[PDB]
Structures are given as structure tokens and as C-alpha cells.
Amino acid sequence: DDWEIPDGQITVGQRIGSGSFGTVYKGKWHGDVAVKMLNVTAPTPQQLQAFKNEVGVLRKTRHVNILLFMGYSTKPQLAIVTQWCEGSSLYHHLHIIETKFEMIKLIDIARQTAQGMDYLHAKSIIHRDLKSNNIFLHEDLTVKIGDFGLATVGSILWMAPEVIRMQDKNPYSFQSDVYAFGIVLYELMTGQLPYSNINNRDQIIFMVGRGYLSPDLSKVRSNCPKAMKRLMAECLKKKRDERPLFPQILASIELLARSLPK
Numbered sequence: 001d002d003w004e005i006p007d008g009q010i011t012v013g014q015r016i017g018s019g020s021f022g023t024v025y026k027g028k029w030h031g032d033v034a035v036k037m038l039n040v041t042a043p044t045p046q047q048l049q050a051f052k053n054e055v056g057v058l059r060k061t062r063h064v065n066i067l068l069f070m071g072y073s074t075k076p077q078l079a080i081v082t083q084w085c086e087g088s089s090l091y092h093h094l095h096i097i098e099t100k101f102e103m104i105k106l107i108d109i110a111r112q113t114a115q116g117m118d119y120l121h122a123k124s125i126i127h128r129d130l131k132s133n134n135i136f137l138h139e140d141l142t143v144k145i146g147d148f149g150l151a152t153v154g155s156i157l158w159m160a161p162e163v164i165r166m167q168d169k170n171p172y173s174f175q176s177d178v179y180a181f182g183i184v185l186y187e188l189m190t191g192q193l194p195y196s197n198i199n200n201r202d203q204i205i206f207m208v209g210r211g212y213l214s215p216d217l218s219k220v221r222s223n224c225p226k227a228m229k230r231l232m233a234e235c236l237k238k239k240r241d242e243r244p245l246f247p248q249i250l251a252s253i254e255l256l257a258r259s260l261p262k
């Protein structure tokens with residue numbers, strides 16, 4: 001029943017990039033796998049706590065739209081093993097290689113992402129870093145949400161105003177996740193990262209924090225449904241209490257999807 005993996009079984013290949021508290025590699029373990037390592041060297045209790053946190057969260061998830069946790073290793077290096085998705089993150093698709101998806105496909109990506117988040121929230125899991133970088137598109141038609149290093153039970157463009165202005169102990173909530181999801185709806189419907197006409201990261205943090213800046217929803221392509229534009233504004237609300245929860249969001253996306261291909 002346990003998920004630990006003995007030293008030697010995992011074969012590490014290509015270094016493909018970074019993830020919360022470490023480095024992502026392509027690996028071999030009963031097939032292609034993603035492996036994230038939280039060392040170099042003897043680990044800090046800082047690392048240890050980050051490791052045990054994520055593993056604990058992942059072993060609680062079993063759902064199509066969530067990156068399948070497969071196992072973990074401590075023996076050589078603190079490592080987390082999940083399934084492999086060829087064809088990159090929504091971020092890479094959108095802002096690097098510039099894949100121009102169709103609206104039917106874009107809406108589907110939103111519905112599937114909403115689907116995974118509803119699951120997470122129904123399980124009382126708050127991702128706390130939902131962004132296009134962590135939305136991986138497996139075999140070009142199935143959305144898997146990954147990276148749970150920050151989750152519980154600086155990528156600022158997705159941060160809610162409350163989260164920006166670090167007030168009280170806990171700014172993170174279902175609603176802050178909803179907000180981050182709002183920005184992915186933006187990325188999907190505009191094809192752009194928000195605030196792209198401002199070349200000052202700090203002015204962006206200050207401004208959104210004080211509520212002077214909000215995503216310009218006039219940039220959504222003309223074939224994007226009005227109901228989607230309407231839902232986006234609801235997720236991007238400056239007051240966290242005025243946001244809908246994912247059950248409600250999911251029902252919204254399903255509805256517009258049904259009466260669309262006509």
C-alpha cells in the first residue's frame with residue numbers, strides 16, 4: 001500500500017526545468033515519468049517539511065484532471081514521481097510556442113481545469129499556485145493540474161489582491177484559487193499574459209494590490225461567448241467574497257459548452 005521507491009529503481013534522464021522546491025527531470029520508472037528532486041546534498045528541515053507536505057497532499061488525489069502521483073523516493077535524493085505528459089504546460093503552449101487553439105478547444109481546457117479544482121476543493125485542498133505553468137496538457141487533449149509543493153488542507157500575475165497585500169496570517173482560500181483560475185481564463189481567451197503593456201513587475205504588484213489595476217477584459221477574442229466573459233469577471237472580482245466557488249463555476253462552463261458548437 002505504501003508508495004516509497006527503493007534506491008536504483010528510478011532512472012533520471014533529461015533536465016526539463018524547475019518546480020516548487022526543486023528541479024524537474026524526465027525519468028524511467030515502469031515507463032516514462034516526471035521526477036522532481038529537492039536536493040543536491042543533505043536536506044534542510046525546510047526541504048523535509050516541503051517534501052512531506054506535497055507527498056501527503058498528492059496521495060489524497062485520484063482524478064483524471066490531476067497529475068497522477070505515482071510514488072516518492074528519499075534514499076538517494078528527496079524525489080516525487082508522477083506520470084509523464086509529452087506536450088507541455090498551457091503556459092508553454094500559449095506564450096512560448098504560441099499554439100493557436102480553437103474556442104471549442106479553449107473552453108474544453110477551462111472545463112477540465114475547473115473539473116480538477118472542484119475535486120481538490122471538495123477534498124479541502126487549496127493549490128495556492130494555480131497558473132498556466134502548472135496546467136499540463138497531456139497528449140494534447142487532457143488537462144492535468146500539477147505541482148502541489150505550495151498546497152494545503154514569485155509568480156504574481158495569478159495572485160489575488162488579498163494575496164498581493166500580505167494582510168493577516170492567511171490570505172489563501174478557495175476564492176484566491178478561483179482568482180488564479182480567472183487569470184487562466186484570461187490567458188485562454190486572450191492568448192496573452194495580463195498587463196503586457198506595463199514593463200514594471202513592481203508597479204504591477206503595487207497596483208493590483210491597491211486595486212488600481214485589473215485585467216483588461218476587452219482583449220477577449222470576438223468569438224469567445226459572452227457568458228465566458230461574464231464568468232471571467234466573477235472570478236476576477238477584487239473582493240474575495242464576491243467570487244463563485246468551483247461547483248458553481250463548473251456548472252457555468254458546462255452550460256455554455258453545450259449550447260456552443262451550433
Ligand SMILES: O=C(Nc1ccncn1)c1oc2cnccc2c1Nc1ccc2c(O)cccc2c1
Binds near residue numbers: 017034035082146149
Ligand atoms: O516542468 C515541466 N515542464 C517545463 C518546465 C519549464 N519549461 C518548460 N517545460 C514539466 O514537464 C512535465 C511533463 N510531465 C509531467 C510533469 C511535468 C512538469 N512539471 C512538474 C511540476 C511539478 C512536479 C511536482 O511538484 C512533483 C513531481 C513532478 C512534477 C513535474
